[PDB]
Amino acid sequence: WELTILHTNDVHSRLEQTSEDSSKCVDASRCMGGVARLFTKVQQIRRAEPNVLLLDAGDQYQGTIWFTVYKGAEVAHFMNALRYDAMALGNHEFDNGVEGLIEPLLKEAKFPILSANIKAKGPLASQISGLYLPYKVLPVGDEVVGIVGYTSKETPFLSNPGTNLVFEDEITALQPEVDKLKTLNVNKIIALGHSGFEMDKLIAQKVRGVDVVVGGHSNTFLYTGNPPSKEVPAGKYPFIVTSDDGRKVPVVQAYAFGKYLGYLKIEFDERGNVISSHGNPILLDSSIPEDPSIKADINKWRIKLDDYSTQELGKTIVYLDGSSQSCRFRECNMGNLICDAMINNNLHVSMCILNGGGIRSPIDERNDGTITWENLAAVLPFGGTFDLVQLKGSTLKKAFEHSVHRYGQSTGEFLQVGGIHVVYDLSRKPGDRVVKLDVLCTKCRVPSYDPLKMDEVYKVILPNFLANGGDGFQMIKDELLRHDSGDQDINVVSTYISKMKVIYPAVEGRIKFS
């Protein structure tokens, strides 16, 4: 018995087709993804294959003006029109709190929403009871497939789920749920969730009875053969894990932003054993036409969003690189721009630090360089604040050592800077990679760069996320000597662009490697 699993993850409000880098579609002839194109491809596979499941591994929430305005109502609506079979909750599904998850999505989805390791307590338990489920048994032709969900244990430190939700260890919460399915004679079981590729491999290894793992959270691109675009595969598709009980368990993920439709075909025997599996994610490029019905419905919902692109804030004559392959690995000019807007809005305060993972989109300059509220909303969608903090020289040095402690994994903690000249030597031991750290003086008439002093104290502008110890910056939350709340992140950057009129940030050598 053959099963076709179609899967998306980390779509992040890319409801309309996008540029190849996932920013706003400017050149329509080479645009990618979007729910209208996704619908065409799914439909084509549903005609060809009898046993199809369309799954989402979370993080449909947050990313573009679509979510800023519609707050998840667009997610429920367009996921229903695509006839998704199930969805696992991701961390961004808690961004507007539990109320922002319950009212627009949990109450409006025509498909089960899953998570087995999320436990509700206190006054919330009675309110959220049954709105999400640990698992769902789905009829697929003449058989049944059991789907178990899971969500990142790190959600309380990444989002706003509130104090009445407990995020348990995925493996500990999944085993009794999979055990329960085996007793109801469900012999085909998919673990669908949002904890990242490393957790996905461990669940494949440790949770007895799991046949396939469909994941997300780490924007993992997997491919067999020659990749069709910019994305470099982290492994073969499917990634095979040998479980502790000796089974070959396929592990799948499909990057992010709706650029690819994950596609895996599994051959099961009558007892639910996996004989074989094969596939690859499908590039949703311009060769696949957008569905007309879905596009016309998208264009209806698009009307209300047009007042966020009517006003021109300013222009860029440079590509504004807010891509994760740049901003999580080296100095990126989107990072320099945002840090220059942070220092400019506060002017003394000479220094800025900004987690690269907080930059969520590039901005393309070819649209006659137009920067709208819509372009900026994709770069900074969280609605955070840029705060002033007082730090020891020693604390700041620990922060920069933390910035590169596990360098090479596309982790969000890599810092973009302003008024700081840092030099890293990656050949050195974690916690000892900063070889040079020069800072801009504040107690001088002519600002210039001098080596940071451990026994000195400095004023730093940074996101409140970092001031509260986000991204593992425990030393900042713990060791800060003063904290003042600042202005709204998007307004800081918007005011600066308007002031400059035309912007051209460069990669200047604020961050170097030795």
Place this chain on the structure above:
Amino acid sequence: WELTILHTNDVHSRLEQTSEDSSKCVDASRCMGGVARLFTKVQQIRRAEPNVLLLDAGDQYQGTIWFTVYKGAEVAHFMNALRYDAMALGNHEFDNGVEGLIEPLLKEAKFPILSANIKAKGPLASQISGLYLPYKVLPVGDEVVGIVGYTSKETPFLSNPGTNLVFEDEITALQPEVDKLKTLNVNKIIALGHSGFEMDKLIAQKVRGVDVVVGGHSNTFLYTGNPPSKEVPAGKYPFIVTSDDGRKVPVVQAYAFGKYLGYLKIEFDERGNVISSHGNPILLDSSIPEDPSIKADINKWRIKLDDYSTQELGKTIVYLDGSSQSCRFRECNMGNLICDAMINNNLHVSMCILNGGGIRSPIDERNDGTITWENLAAVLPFGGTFDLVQLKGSTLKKAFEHSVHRYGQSTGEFLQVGGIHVVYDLSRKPGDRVVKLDVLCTKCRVPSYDPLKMDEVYKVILPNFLANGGDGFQMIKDELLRHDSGDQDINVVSTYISKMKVIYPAVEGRIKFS
């Protein structure tokens, strides 16, 4: 017979008292120089000494809003009120051409104006005949003192004297004039002129009959003992040169901007031989009160100049270091600001070069950081243009080697930059001191720094002065592949400050030493 020589040079329109750095007087209690303070001190010496000569060694012209507006009429007027005895022509006396020298100064001075090496030809010879003289024999008590003038041979490459004035070698033109004085039995001879300290020493050495050399042009500070301010002496005051005929010839200079009054007492015998000489420049600080009559006359002329300080263009929160001890020796933030205004006014063009000698004043930030047209007029008083030029990588490298070829002499050719990261190793041979030269790409979507290529061509914004081979940049004039005239220097910087509203340029590492 004892003679007191009081002398000024390179006053450069500092008619009013200034800050210690020679910019606008903000804190009156610690202000310096000015013609009112100069008058008090001269008067005090005239009461004490019977044989006094008040001399000016040129460059009274150009420097502040006083010259921009009054065009030399203020020079004639205030030099007359101070009762100067003679003045040698400097290069800045030709800035408004010969017409701008003849009508406001040559026709209005109540004292002889001198230069023996300037020869008029063509239709100009009959117009300027007798308006300036090669020498003047002056009665001083019961004796006569002969004063011979000279002007820098480099004036045609520094100013606008036109095509009808020939600047001959100083020594060749001075000897027959001094010879003529010896025949009229003038046995006391002062060479007063504007060619710089190195020429002054050579004239002292080579021109037979010259008793003393009173110079200017090189802003040379000379002192015996412990200096009273920021200025570091280049030697003792007077600087002694032994002439080829065996005489001890004192050589004097008094820095610039009217901060010091040069003071030299010479003991002559009845035959005009110099027995002895001694003195030192006098710091014209707040301890010397400004003359009330002169101050009230200054305040009368000050009224018309107040409409250049009424409008606030913007604010600075940093000291804007346009001092020659910074801008001719290392990266200075006034240089970075002007280069950022040059690139901003033209935006591709990514690179800027600016001769440090072209920056003529700092701007102080303590006046609530106010930047007026008057502050800017002292920084950029020449009214030049910032032009676009196309240069070979090899040409640009030659220019940067020229920039530091004779480093250490406070020479104007040292370049301030924009979109360029240069590293110098001064321990190396002239013409081979550039060890690193990285430039900002133009043919890229994300601007970043890459090593300059010799066989590549680049668009550079620079002053027309440099595009015409000024400051010995013969390779720029000779090797440029394209030249386009730009916008007026002061307007470029003014428009940029207005756009920024608040400025804070730093010293960033655009220029480094290895």
